[PDB]
């Protein structure tokens, strides 16, 4: 008992001081972002690892080092057209300012007449999504290894007044050591107080988002619950062929658990997936600590997860640099840069 009360009552002082120093580092790069730290022709383009609304992420090779990265290429023109300037600007501004062991590191970013570019660390493990579906589901200890990384990641982002808004296996890359690197900060926003945009993945949307209520940090804790349920079950708690059926399941107030879920899991999950904001874990007087101290996390050495001293229960096949076996195949499109600058004013700060 008493050794864990000196350990617990001291871990917390280290954490209060870690976070303060993290808020300073973040604020420095947030009030003064790095711009134009590379150029397109410095990388060879090999293969598409993924796509989104305005372009794609590609495996690329930096010719001076031969280091492989993942480059996100967005077409400025489609961004303007879809009225997402602000969201694309938040994404880069936030990635370039953040810093944590489970956040994808942004190395360089730049722009040319046509496109925006973000060059990030390559995670050759591919997305959690891909191994979750292949295998069916993860065991609770396997799910918990991942969940703990998400819990601390949000503790970080929320301390920075950030909200992530797109938790789901698709956005959780697996690195060479089997740990998580969260990507796709397209929906992230720095915010004190309330925000209103209806966005996110249907399955992971919190009720107060569906109901146009105006919402905060807490929608991320709802999402953590959806993630832990999907990881542990092989399917999400709310699904259906049409989104409008998903939304009504989410607001009904009601969830069913597989017979294989432990009681501790079910109880952690009943408190994350709580419609009543006064009752949802992550959102009470004690905050994240209600989740950390929950019985399901009894085996979790929170400090050892931060320091990556715990064994990943799943280290992927690593067939050397520049290999993409852990990724799906996509149609390739040639990158075309124009001789005319598009949307210069709209993207000045990028």
């Amino acid at each position: 008992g008493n050794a864990a009360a000196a350990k617990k009552g001291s871990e917390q002082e280290s954490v209060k001081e870690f976070l303060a120093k993290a808020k300073e580092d973040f604020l420095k790069k947030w009030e003064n972002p790095a711009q134009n730290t590379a150029h397109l022709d410095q990388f060879e383009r090999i293969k598409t690892l993924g796509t989104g609304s305005f372009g794609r992420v590609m495996l690329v090779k930096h010719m001076e080092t031969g280091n492989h990265y993942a480059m996100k290429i967005l077409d400025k023109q489609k961004v303007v057209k879809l009225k997402e300037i602000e969201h694309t600007l938040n994404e880069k501004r936030i990635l370039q300012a953040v810093n944590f062991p489970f956040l994808v590191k942004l190395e360089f970013s730049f722009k040319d007449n046509s496109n925006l570019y973000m060059v990030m660390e390559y995670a050759p493990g591919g997305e959690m999504f891909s191994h979750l579906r292949r295998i069916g589901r993860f065991s609770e200890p396997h799910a918990r290894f991942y969940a703990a990384q998400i819990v601390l990641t949000f503790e970080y982002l929320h301390s920075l007044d950030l909200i992530y808004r797109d938790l789901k296996p698709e956005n959780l890359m697996i690195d060479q050591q089997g740990y998580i690197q969260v990507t796709d900060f397209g929906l992230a926003k720095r915010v004190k107080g309330r925000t209103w945009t209806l966005c996110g993945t249907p399955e992971y949307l919190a009720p107060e988002i569906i109901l146009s209520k105006g919402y905060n940090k807490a929608v991320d804790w709802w999402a953590l619950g959806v993630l832990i349920y999907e990881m542990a079950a092989g399917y999400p708690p709310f699904f259906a062929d049409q989104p409008i059926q998903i939304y009504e399941k989410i607001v009904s107030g009601k969830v069913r658990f597989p017979s294989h879920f432990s009681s501790d899991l079910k109880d952690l999950l009943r408190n994350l997936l709580q419609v009543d904001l006064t009752k949802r874990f992550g959102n009470l007087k004690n905050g994240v600590n209600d989740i950390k101290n929950h019985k399901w996390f009894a085996t979790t050495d929170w400090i050892a997860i931060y320091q990556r001293k715990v064994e990943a229960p799943f280290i992927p096949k690593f067939k050397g640099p520049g290999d993409t076996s852990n990724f799906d195949d996509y149609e390739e499109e040639e990158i075309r840069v124009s001789i005319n600058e598009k949307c210069g004013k709209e993207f000045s700060e990028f």
Partner: peptide
């Protein structure tokens, strides 16, 4: 079972976010 209902649905693929 709930797992067969899921596998037979159209939400087992890579999922896109919305923007209302």
């Amino acid at each position: 079972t709930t797992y067969a209902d899921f596998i037979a649905s159209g939400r087992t693929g890579r999922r896109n976010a919305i923007h209302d």
